[PDB]
């Protein structure tokens, strides 16, 4: 009964951390492309 | 209180086992890079 | 079928109307005079509030070797031995539960500090890979 | 409930759900665009009038204020979803407009393809084509990436083509269809593009700055094309977990984007199915077909 | 706080040492007096060891005690034998009604205990997938960010 109540709250916090951790990783992916895209502009 | 603690203690203990191995993976990754 | 105070099999069970639980009349009557409330739920309860219940009566077969002699000597002796050595051993069990409580909460808080210490460690190691 | 909608006198070719999930838009061979209440009693209100050709494709802008309509009369109309008044006519292509897409996020843009083999980029404020990509084969389906930098075009050459707005070059070619591509669509993430083709293959392709280089990410099966040679369109679920594509065998096919198992094969239609759409919030499917009826399946 | 039990199939001795290192860093009357003394000392108070032994030729009283209790005994065995085994087997039936009630509660607890664990299982499998989704995406960036820089 107790294990259910303390666990159920910990998972949102586990996920929400990884969710924000994923958001930052997407930004580095989102910019690194643009520098590659700008290789074609100089050509 | 004894039962809820011992269960939640060894439960919270598994947080460390997971955390330690990920921390470790971050070291050799960054080190080798 | 049992009483919810002593752990008896009651001879005159009576039920309280605030919390449905059967007690033996003598033991519930004593609690109300000590402090006028229901022992389990801590709700307001009086002697008139109780309701006596009826059942087919309880039967104990008095042993074959039953006389005034063993009942005075051997049986009554064993009853006050069994009361004495149990509650003393029960007081020993309550003392260790509080000691083993302290080892639980300390080891728990010790683990909390490890997690908090490793929460700063991991995400900054992941952040360094991002950088 | 299922809910059955009727009213279109001719084949329905396309249907969409309003971005806010309050209304549906549908159109086909009749030349009328009907609006429907998603809830209540599923009532029909405004009819958009003014297309002389048949309506080949509807889209909403991301705001749900503008509804775009490619017609066979070579005109792409822009419609006001609120009043039902026509806004603009993109007169430009020399032949039938087969399909159109409106760029989400960025300043208003529209892409079209037609039977003249060209793909055109429109700024709704100019009343003139901005760029033209002469292909060589008739173009059937066209969509923008989320960055509004690239144009993705599907034709009858079995090869999905990607165009760069700045370089104006054939950037990418995708091989993997054995026959004509009839319907394209981007994932809500920008991550994946969904294609239907005569070869009866549904293929997902992943478009990324960093690409594996042979992006046949997944293949699904079940979806049949036949002698009607109807254009077939496919849609992504709001969360990218489900894939629906219409077929000519009277069944709506819905697959699991990962395991590729058929989640649903749904009947009720008498003829070929032309488009399947997902409600943006709830697991509701609008299936449009040539039998002139729509269903509101709930999952 | 979060540690998935059902999902984590793959350290206790290791984590115990790290938890150990953080621990290296950090109402009755007279009745109760004689009862606690009897239990502590481990000695029961002696009863009347007199009636049983006695001796022929103070003992005139001890003799007369044995008679009245023996007559009470023989009357106390008469009223038992009159009913006999009927009074015993009537109480034996009561003990079977008392027993079965306990094992019904053993089942009710068994069901709700497995029912709580059953709900937890689904939660573990829900998130463990979501964590798997996150890690795959994590590894994709990790190499994607590299392959972007290698080409630049």
Curated annotation (Swiss-Prot), chain A:
Residue stretches spanning the membrane: none
Q: How is it modified after translation?
A: Phosphorylated on serine and threonine residues. Has no effect on subcellular location nor on homodimerization. Phosphorylated in vitro by CDK2. Phosphorylation enhances interaction with PPP1R8.
Subcellular location field: Nucleus; Nucleus speckle; Cytoplasm
Tissue specificity: Ubiquitously expressed in both fetal and adult tissues.
Residue ranges that the Swiss-Prot or TrEMBL entry lists as coiled coil:
12-43
* Lineage: superkingdom: Eukaryota
| Illness the protein is tied to | A chromosomal aberration involving CDC5L is found in multicystic renal dysplasia. Translocation t(6;19)(p21;q13.1) with USF2.
Q: Which family does it belong to?
A: Belongs to the CEF1 family.
Q: Subunit structure of this entry?
A: Homodimer. Interacts with DAPK3. Component of the precatalytic, catalytic and postcatalytic spliceosome complexes. Part of a spliceosomal 'core' complex consisting of CDC5L, PLRG1, SPF27, CCAP1, CCAP3 and CCAP6. Interacts with PLRG1, Lodestar/TTF2, and NIPP1/PPP1R8. Component of the minor spliceosome, which splices U12-type introns. Within this complex, interacts with SCNM1. Component of the PRP19-CDC5L splicing complex composed of a core complex comprising a homotetramer of PRPF19, CDC5L, PLRG1 and BCAS2, and at least three less stably associated proteins CTNNBL1, CWC15 and HSPA8.
Name of this chain's protein: Cell division cycle 5-like protein
Encoding gene (name): CDC5L
UniProtKB/Swiss-Prot annotation, chain B:
Tell me what turns on expression of this protein.
Answer: By gamma irradiation and chemical mutagens but not by UV irradiation.
* Localization of this protein: Nucleus; Nucleus, Nucleoplasm; Cytoplasm, Cytoskeleton, Spindle; Cytoplasm
**Residues with N6-acetyllysine modification:** 21
Q: Where is the signal peptide?
A: none
Which tissue types show expression of this protein?
Ubiquitous. Weakly expressed in senescent cells of different tissue origins. Highly expressed in tumor cell lines.
- What does this chain do? Ubiquitin-protein ligase which is a core component of several complexes mainly involved pre-mRNA splicing and DNA repair. Required for pre-mRNA splicing as component of the spliceosome. Core component of the PRP19C/Prp19 complex/NTC/Nineteen complex which is part of the spliceosome and participates in its assembly, its remodeling and is required for its activity. During assembly of the spliceosome, mediates 'Lys-63'-linked polyubiquitination of the U4 spliceosomal protein PRPF3.
| Family statement | Belongs to the WD repeat PRP19 family.
The free-text domain note is:
The 7 WD repeats are necessary and sufficient to support interaction with the RPA complex.
Name by which UniProt lists this protein = Pre-mRNA-processing factor 19
Q: Which organism is it from?
A: Homo sapiens
This protein's gene is called: PRPF19
Swiss-Prot record, chain D:
Q: What does UniProt give as GO cellular component?
A: catalytic step 2 spliceosome; cytosol; nuclear speck; nucleoplasm; nucleus; sno(s)RNA-containing ribonucleoprotein complex; U2-type catalytic step 2 spliceosome; U4/U6 x U5 tri-snRNP complex
| Localization, UniProt | Nucleus
Q: Which UniProt keywords apply?
A: Isopeptide bond, Methylation, mRNA processing, mRNA splicing, Nucleus, Repeat, Spliceosome, Ubl conjugation, WD repeat
The name under which this protein is listed is U5 small nuclear ribonucleoprotein 40 kDa protein
Signal sequence coordinates: none
Covalent cross-link Glycyl lysine isopeptide (Lys-Gly) (interchain with G-Cter in SUMO2) as placed by the record, residue numbers: 213
Assembly mode: Component of the pre-catalytic and catalytic spliceosome complexes. Component of the postcatalytic spliceosome P complex. Part of the U5 snRNP complex. Interacts with PRPF8. Component of the U4/U6-U5 tri-snRNP complex composed of the U4, U6 and U5 snRNAs and at least PRPF3, PRPF4, PRPF6, PRPF8, PRPF31, SNRNP200, TXNL4A, WDR57, SNRNP40, DDX23, CD2BP2, PPIH, SNU13, EFTUD2, SART1 and USP39. Component of the minor spliceosome, which splices U12-type introns.
> One GO BP annotation here?
RNA processing
Q: Which GO terms describe its molecular function?
A: RNA binding
Give the gene name. SNRNP40
UniProt keyword Nucleus present: yes
Its job:
Required for pre-mRNA splicing as component of the activated spliceosome. Component of the U5 small nuclear ribonucleoprotein (snRNP) complex and the U4/U6-U5 tri-snRNP complex, building blocks of the spliceosome. As a component of the minor spliceosome, involved in the splicing of U12-type introns in pre-mRNAs.
Ranges occupied by WD repeats? 7-46, 50-89, 92-132, 134-173, 176-215, 226-265, 268-299
Curated annotation (Swiss-Prot), chain E:
Q: Which residues form a coiled coil?
A: 91-152
Task: Tell where it localizes.
Answer: Nucleus; Nucleus, Nucleolus
| Tissue-by-tissue expression | Ubiquitously expressed.
Record's GO cellular component terms: catalytic step 2 spliceosome; centrosome; nuclear speck; nucleolus; nucleoplasm; nucleus; Prp19 complex; spliceosomal complex
Q: Which GO terms describe its biological process?
A: alternative mRNA splicing, via spliceosome; mRNA splicing, via spliceosome; oocyte development; ovarian follicle development; protein catabolic process; RNA splicing; RNA splicing, via transesterification reactions; spindle assembly
Say yes or no: keyword Acetylation present. Answer: yes
Which keywords, in A-to-Z order, does the entry hold?
Answer: Acetylation, Coiled coil, mRNA processing, mRNA splicing, Nucleus, Phosphoprotein, Spliceosome
Subunit and partners: Component of the pre-catalytic and catalytic spliceosome complexes. Component of the postcatalytic spliceosome P complex. Component of the PRP19-CDC5L splicing complex composed of a core complex comprising a homotetramer of PRPF19, CDC5L, PLRG1 and BCAS2, and at least three less stably associated proteins CTNNBL1, CWC15 and HSPA8. Interacts directly in the complex with PRPF19, CDC5L and PLRG1.
Entry similarity comment: Belongs to the SPF27 family.
**Name of the protein in question:** Pre-mRNA-splicing factor SPF27
- Give the organism the record lists: Homo sapiens
Q: What range of the parent protein does this fragment cover?
A: 13 to 199 of 225
